[PDB]
């Protein structure tokens, strides 16, 4: 957070109380999935 | 004894390649087209 137009509220070594705060709401943890499918072209052994 | 000798040269005609009768030599690569050499052992031979 920076100030109105001040530097940065990370420089003055100053403490502030008012400033500005992110917020993400219910369910932002929803975990992920993914998948895949396997085939094989050539076998190990093979031939008649 | 010419019971066995014949046995094993008839077994000797479907296995190592190297080696033909005089004349035809393309049916024989038509025969011996499912051994696939040189996957054949002696566990095989045995067997054979």
């Known amino acids: ?48 | 004894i010419d019971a066995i000798c014949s046995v094993e040269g008839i077994l000797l005609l479907i296995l190592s390649r190297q080696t033909t009768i005089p004349g035809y030599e393309d049916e024989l690569n038509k025969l011996r087209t499912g051994i696939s050499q040189p996957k054949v052992t002696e566990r095989q031979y045995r067997r054979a």
């Open chain 1, 1 to 48: 957070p920076i100030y109105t137009s001040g530097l940065q509220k990370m420089q003055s070594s100053k403490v502030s109380m008012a400033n500005v705060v992110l917020s993400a709401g219910s369910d932002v943890i929803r975990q992920a999935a993914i998948k895949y499918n396997v085939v094989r072209t050539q076998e190990i052994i093979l031939f008649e």
